[PDB]
């Protein structure tokens, strides 16, 4: 069953953008997020995400400015992944629909 997954304490460790094969007028900004301090056994140690970007409207989207900002600062996030899937390096990736920063222990356990 497809449903939205909300993740916690994830940092964006890689960012990329690739041409969207489905439509020539859109554009995919993908990335990799990792749980802070988790081991390899956990499924959150390496989660792929991708979100679409329109190529007709100029300017960086609200999603991209954060994904730019939270990348070199290595801040934790709370990513609303899903429920749709996109392609990243052949491997499937979960689409990103909402991203929120980590205030502290209260909302990022």
């Amino acid at each position, epitope marked *: 069953v*497809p449903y939205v*997954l909300v993740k916690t304490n994830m940092v964006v460790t890689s960012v990329a953008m690739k041409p969207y094969e489905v439509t020539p007028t859109r554009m995919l900004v993908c990335g990799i997020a990792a749980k802070l301090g988790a081991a390899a*056994s956990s499924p959150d140690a390496h989660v792929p995400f991708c979100f679409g970007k329109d190529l007709k409207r100029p300017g960086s989207s609200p999603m991209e400015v954060m994904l730019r900002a939270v990348f070199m600062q290595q801040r934790p996030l709370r990513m609303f*992944l899903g429920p749709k899937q996109l392609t990243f390096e*052949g*491997k*499937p990736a*979960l689409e990103l629909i909402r991203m929120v920063e980590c205030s502290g222990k209260q909302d990022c356990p």
Partner: antibody
Amino acid sequence: AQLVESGGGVVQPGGSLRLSCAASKFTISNDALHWVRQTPGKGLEWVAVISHDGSNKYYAASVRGRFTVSRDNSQNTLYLQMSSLRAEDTAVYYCAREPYCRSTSCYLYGAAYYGLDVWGQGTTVTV
Amino acid sequence: DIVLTQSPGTLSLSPGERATLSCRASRSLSSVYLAWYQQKPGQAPRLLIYGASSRATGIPDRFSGSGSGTDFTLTISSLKPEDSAVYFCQQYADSPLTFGGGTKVEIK
């Protein structure tokens, strides 16, 4: 739950083949489907995947851009389209149905994985 | 790219003994993303065990799974001559759905 696995294999190193899966009785619109190849040398290998509505498709490393997957719910059939096949594509091509995962991969969502359980008799494709 | 290895190879067991197969991975897999298959000579495989903890509808109550991690084992216990085939282990914890080499069981 029976599949016929139409499509026959003899092709020169550049040709193209269109293999067809067909559901006998059970409806196919609400389940995902897979293609699995079996070479007597290298064992069983995974070919491609397709979702229920066709939104998500994924392929293997060797057939990433060459092969293609299509599904038609009107005839309750699943198709595989091949680009140019080299000599390494000699194998038997099967059909699989991952039962309850409408989305292609259930490993992201954390949901339980139910394994296939419906394979067809297979078709032999060689070059 | 998780490589699943079944080290025993080919097993020759009497029609009364207990069959033990070992499937191990290069990295740890969640217990829910591993399955076992039975490939009788000449036909298509059908799943026996999924998630190493439950059986398909038509599978008889003779096959059991094992614990999670990097070691997974399947046990046949009572071994009728009907169960001479080649057994595979499959993972779906990542993008490449990788099977294993397969172990051939022989009944004397």
